[PDB]
């Protein structure tokens, strides 16, 4: 049940893709560490909540 993923390598040694291994030891998902691989989303629901969303090169009020 080993889980393998790629690290995002910041500073590189003078030595490519590097990995790390994760194994969950507990039955309750609460006990698990954080994956930290998280998906991002559109600001739109906050920055543009308009019924008729308009395009930036056009007049906001028409």
């Amino acid at each position: 049940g080993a889980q393998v993923s790629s690290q995002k390598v910041g500073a590189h040694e003078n030595s490519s893709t590097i990995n790390y291994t994760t194994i969950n030891y507990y039955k309750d998902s609460a006990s698990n560490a954080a994956s930290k691989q998280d998906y991002s989303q559109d600001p739109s629901k906050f920055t543009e909540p308009l019924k008729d969303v308009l395009i930036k090169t056009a007049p906001a009020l028409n």
Binding site: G1, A2, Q3, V4, S5
Partner: peptide, 4 residues
Amino acid sequence: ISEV
């Protein structure tokens, strides 16, 4: 294993 599950290599992602």
